[PDB]
Amino acid sequence: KNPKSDKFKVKRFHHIEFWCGDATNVARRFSWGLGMRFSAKSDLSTGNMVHASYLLTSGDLRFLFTAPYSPSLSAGEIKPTTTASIPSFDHGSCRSFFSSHGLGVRAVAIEVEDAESAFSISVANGAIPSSPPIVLNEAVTIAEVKLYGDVVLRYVSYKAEFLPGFERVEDASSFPLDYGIRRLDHAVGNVPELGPALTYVAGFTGFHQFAEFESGLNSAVLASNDEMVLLPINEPVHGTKRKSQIQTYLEHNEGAGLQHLALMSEDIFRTLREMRKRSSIGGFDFMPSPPPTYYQNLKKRVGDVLSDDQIKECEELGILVDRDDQGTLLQIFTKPLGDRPTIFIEIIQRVGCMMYQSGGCGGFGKGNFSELFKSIEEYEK
């Protein structure tokens, strides 16, 4: 069921912001690794004495990378006189985030009809405020509330190009890479206790539990009215033979934070071919492929959705497949994006549920846990 209880008008995922120590190197590695173009900048060359911020785009997917300059550059400024293009930025908060968590996501940004109302209603409804609504050049309004750990849910709204004060990146610098990635499908947090995290977040958003379908985790998914903003949350299961990777996340991240970003591709086979070509030359590595038993059992499961050629192409690329009662899902996971075993990326493509495609079509790969266990067990013999 879908009660459509959003307490304010939510549109779509707008951008994801990584807090970094050096934004240039992370941005350039991600661009090559994922096929995302440099499309806007806010830094010293644009008058910003506070932070360096570089935006990568692919389709509607926006990855923002931000790092602080030396505070001495802006020591004479005050908030009314700031040159920061993102007024919520804070040198100390940023350095503290990165030294506590390493490279990771600071802001999950969703676009809303009215960022001030969304902020006001949110905190009226239990949200811990993080940065009050601020109106940028009479054009854009931005506001932030705590989501979990040191991650904020950021609201953005436009009266009528990324943000004021950002400049388009010169086209000679902007090389039009594209490996097929098109938008953010879901952004997933890890926490020590699912219950209170769910209660808090659904409490101030009105997001409902997305209706779905013993190793690892327990999860639940929060979704907006049209279920295009999807915010799953995991917690660890303690005691198992294999140590919970959610617990490993919490230890290495120093607590709760964003675990994985799932990026929708319009052609997962082209995306995975292009990213795998670059794994060893600056891009991203992928988790170990499932054993061939897994693909031998795929025909009995999605033989009506994927031809024998498409299923063997899954085998080369290491793609996983799962299926709801309404759609089929193709998915694969990268290795951690940085030094720590914390944040990683998921590539997905959804087939089915056309009316546009409805959100979550196929679920999130729930069936692939038992299928992978049964496959390792079958293959071993």
Binding site for its own copies (CB under 8 A): 20-26, 28-33, 38, 43-44, 52, 67, 69-70, 72-73, 95, 98-100, 102-103, 172-175, 177, 251-254, 280-283, 285, 337-341
CB of 285 vs its own copies, minimal distance in Å: 8
Distance CA(245)–CA(258), nearest Å, equals 13
Judged by beta carbon distances under 5 to 8 A according to partner kind, the member of ligand 9V4, Co ion, its own copies, none in contact with residue 135 is none
Which of 180, 160, 159, 177 lies closest to 169, judged by CA? 177
* Nearer to ligand 9V4 among residue 199 and residue 218 (C-beta): 218
CA distances from 71 to 74, 84, 95, 276 (A): 6, 12, 11, 40
Determine the Cα angle at 350 with ends 346 and 355, to 5°. 145
Instruction: Work out which of 14, 186, 208, 323 binds ligand 9V4, going by CB under 6 A.
Output: 186
In contact, 39 and 54? CB cutoff 8 Å: no
List Cβ neighbours of 300 (8 Å cut-off, separation of 6 or more). Answer: none
Longest dimension (CA), the chain: 70
Judged by beta carbon distances under 5 to 8 A according to partner kind, the member of ligand 9V4, its own copies, Co ion, none in contact with residue 221 is ligand 9V4
* Nearer to ligand 9V4 among residue 169 and residue 305 (C-beta): 305
Which of 86, 73, 17 lies closest to 44, judged by CA? 73
Is position 341 an interface residue for ligand 9V4 (rule: CB under 6 A)?
no
List Cβ neighbours of 191 (8 Å cut-off, separation of 6 or more). Answer: 148, 149, 197, 233, 234, 235, 250, 256
CA atoms within 13 A on the CB side of 258: 30
CB of 69 vs its own copies, minimal distance in Å: 7
Strands (E), the chain: 10-19, 37-42, 51-58, 61-68, 104-112, 129-136, 140-148, 151-158, 167-168, 181-190, 208-209, 217-223, 230-236, 257-265, 320-323, 327-333, 344-352
Instruction: Tell whether 15 is in a known binding site.
Output: no
Distance CA(78)–CA(80), nearest Å, equals 6
Is position 320 an interface residue for ligand 9V4 (rule: CB under 6 A)?
yes
CA dihedral for 302, 303, 306, 310, sign (positive or negative): positive
CB of 184 vs its own copies, minimal distance in Å: 20
Scanning residues 79 to 108, which ones bind ligand 9V4 (CB under 6 A)? none
Judged by beta carbon distances under 5 to 8 A according to partner kind, the member of ligand 9V4, its own copies, Co ion, none in contact with residue 175 is its own copies
Instruction: Tell me which stretch binds ligand 9V4 (CB under 6 A): 91-99, 102-110, 119-127, 363-371.
Output: 363-371
Instruction: Tell whether 377 is in a known binding site.
Output: no
Q: Return the axis-axis angle of helices 268-278 and 308-317, rounded to nearest 10°.
A: 30
Is position 208 an interface residue for ligand 9V4 (rule: CB under 6 A)?
no
Looking at residue 72, what DSSP letter applies? G
* Nearer to ligand 9V4 among residue 168 and residue 374 (C-beta): 374
Instruction: Tell whether 238 is in a known binding site.
Output: no
Instruction: Work out which of 42, 117, 190, 368 binds ligand 9V4, going by CB under 6 A.
Output: 368
Is position 323 an interface residue for ligand 9V4 (rule: CB under 6 A)?
no
Give me the 250-269 binding string for ligand 9V4, x by CB under 6 A, dash otherwise: ----------x---------
Judged by beta carbon distances under 5 to 8 A according to partner kind, the member of its own copies, ligand 9V4, Co ion, none in contact with residue 29 is its own copies
Instruction: Tell me which stretch binds Co ion (CB under 5 A): 10-18, 60-68, 255-263, 319-327.
Output: 255-263
CB of 271 vs its own copies, minimal distance in Å: 17
- For Co ion, the binding residues (CB under 5 A) are 262, 346, 364
- For ligand 9V4, the binding residues (CB under 6 A) are 186, 188, 219, 221, 232, 260, 320, 333, 346, 364-365, 368-369, 372
**Binding positions for Fe cation:** 186, 260, 346
